[PDB]
Write a protein that binds this ligand. Structure first.
Ligand SMILES: CN(C)CCC[C@@]1(c2ccc(F)cc2)OCc2cc(C#N)ccc21
Ligand SMILES: [Cl-]
Length: 548
């Protein structure tokens, strides 16, 4: 049972809300197949080494994202930045679960609300295919999602978000209460019910793929998926999106991996964990893209519109597609219930992990918080509840888009780049390899060390620079955000990006001694500060820097 339980755990942890909800619309927005080349390249080159490095760090040091930097005290700022990024993401990661809960609640009927027009929320322009460069938006499913769930028609933009919707308010309240009561007692919350949540997503994806392949218009969608438009690979939007989606789905850059590995056994095999998780994530992403493109090709055939204009490119793509695929099934009510229960469970577990990252990171830093986990959990959950209250308004989709674009974009890329640079160069790739050997029994191969030291940081810096200089103003379908919205988004990104130099400056000023003494104390492990007085620093010799 050692291997079967491990396989269940790894397959459960290998699929996130990202793979199911965010990958579809990022793949649709980027042409389809053309998005998989950057995705797979980045996956290997950066994602696999960074996943492995974070797991090894957490396992060896037994600390959260913040306090794990006792090895290189100057990067506690990086730790704080990743914790803040996780906190930001949790603001809308819960609104998505609220949407899923609302859909599940509305799915308990023999006549699904997303099948035809004729309801209170339908506009006079609603078009029913059975009864008779834009994105359409006049279909029963799109009309339902945008009017009877979001009530987006009552807001003119991000300047007129309006008051919170009370149905989504109740759903968010339920989600937050469940999260708190699942986090308040301790980290140990697995091995009890995750069995169903680890297999259900794969079953749902399998059934959807099998059913969608046999649809009238699925062939065109599959052709559009397997057709690669190489012109799109010279714009850098696809590359930025692929990198960000990778660091989202894999879980790196949020401090989740370090916090969760801090509870692993000292002899746990992180290399096999990273390899298996990366392979599963790649296969799942490819299958999900295939099924999504099949579904939207079927819809394009159904609605007599081009595949590029059939559906939205925003965060509601799954809530438009999956109900439309369910409506084509027999006993569609049961399938809808099953799918949305799956989505609820997956989102709940993912948000639970994201919030546990923050809780552990802050509790390891301050012992008072670690002594009062109940109050700290309540405070974190209440803050998330309010800042997600901000995202359930009538124009809440615009705020959600702004967050999903800015909270972890260049910010998460920069945080991961700083993590990699810090460890590999200042702490030492040789030291990290020695630690991994002492931990798991074998030294990492040359490929891993090269990826950690040279390849991954270079690509991360390149993508960060390109995202900064090649920045497209924010938009949501046909709505162009005003400039101050972009300024606010860049301020949000900087809020977590700037914690690195700020903490470096604070650490330098707070330390006592000469400039060289300050540097030595800053770039030396906290448990080896007794060598600073002996003027024996490895970082001050060229051998340390040229070591690979
Ligand atoms: C952006 N989000 C927040 C990242 C979440 C990462 C994740 C995680 C933690 C440790 C790992 F080794 C691997 C993945 O946290 C828990 C979890 C649960 C599921 C489920 N079902 C899926 C992923 C995770
Ligand atoms: Cl993904």
């Amino acid at each position: 049972g050692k291997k079967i339980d491990f396989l269940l755990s790894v397959v459960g942890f290998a699929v996130d809300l990202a793979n199911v909800w965010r990958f579809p619309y990022l793949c649709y927005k980027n042409g389809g197949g053309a998005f998989l080349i950057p995705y797979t390249l980045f996956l290997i080159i950066a994602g696999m080494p960074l996943f492995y490095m974070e797991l090894a760090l957490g396992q060896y040091n037994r600390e959260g994202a913040a306090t794990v930097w006792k090895i290189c005290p100057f990067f506690k700022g990086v730790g704080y930045a990743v914790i803040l990024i996780a906190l930001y993401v949790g603001f809308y990661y819960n609104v998505i679960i609220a949407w899923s809960l609302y859909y599940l609640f509305s799915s308990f009927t023999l006549n699904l609300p997303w099948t035809d027009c004729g309801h209170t929320w339908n506009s006079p322009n609603c078009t029913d295919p059975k009864l008779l460069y834009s994105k359409y938006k006049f279909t029963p499913a799109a009309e339902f999602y945008e009017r009877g769930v979001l009530h987006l028609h009552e807001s003119s933009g991000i300047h007129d978000i309006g008051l919170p919707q009370w149905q989504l308010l109740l759903c968010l309240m339920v989600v937050v209460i469940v999260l708190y009561f699942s986090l308040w007692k301790g980290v140990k919350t697995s091995g009890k019910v995750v069995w169903i949540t680890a297999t259900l997503p794969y079953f749902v994806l399998f059934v959807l793929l099998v059913h969608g392949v046999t649809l009238p218009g699925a062939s065109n969608g599959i052709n559009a998926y397997l057709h690669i438009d190489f012109y799109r690979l010279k714009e850098a939007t696809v590359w930025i999106d692929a990198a960000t989606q990778i660091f989202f789905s894999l879980g790196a850059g949020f401090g989740v991996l370090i916090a969760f590995a801090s509870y692993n056994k000292f002899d746990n095999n992180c290399y096999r964990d990273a390899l298996l998780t990366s392979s599963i994530n790649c296969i799942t992403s490819f299958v999900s893209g295939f099924a999504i493109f099949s579904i939207l090709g079927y819809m394009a055939h159904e609605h007599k519109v081009n595949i590029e204009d059939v559906a939205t490119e925003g965060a509601g793509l799954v809530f438009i597609l999956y109900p439309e695929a369910i409506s084509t099934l027999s006993g569609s009510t049961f399938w809808a219930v099953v799918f949305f229960v799956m989505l609820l469970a997956l989102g709940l577990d993912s948000s639970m992990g994201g919030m546990e990252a923050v809780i552990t990171g802050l509790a390891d830093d301050f012992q008072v918080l670690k002594r009062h986990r109940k109050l700290f959990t309540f405070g974190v959950t209440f803050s998330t509840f309010l800042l997600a209250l901000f995202c359930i308004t009538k124009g809440g989709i615009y705020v959600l888009t702004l967050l999903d674009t800015f909270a972890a974009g260049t910010s998460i890329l920069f945080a991961v780049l700083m993590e990699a640079i810090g460890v590999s160069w200042f702490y030492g790739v040789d030291r990290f390899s020695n630690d991994i050997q002492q931990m798991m029994g074998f030294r990492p191969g040359l490929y891993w060390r090269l990826c950690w030291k040279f390849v991954s940081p270079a690509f991360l810096l390149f993508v960060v620079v390109v995202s900064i200089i090649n920045f497209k103003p924010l938009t949501y379908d046909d709505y162009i955000f005003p400039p101050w919205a972009n300024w606010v988004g860049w301020g949000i990104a900087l809020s977590s990006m700037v914690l690195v130099p700020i903490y470096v400056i604070y650490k330098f000023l707070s330390t006592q001694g000469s400039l060289w003494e300050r540097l030595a104390y800053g770039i030396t492990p906290e448990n080896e500060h007794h060598l600073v007085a002996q003027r024996d620093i490895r970082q001050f010799q060229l051998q340390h820097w040229l070591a690979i």
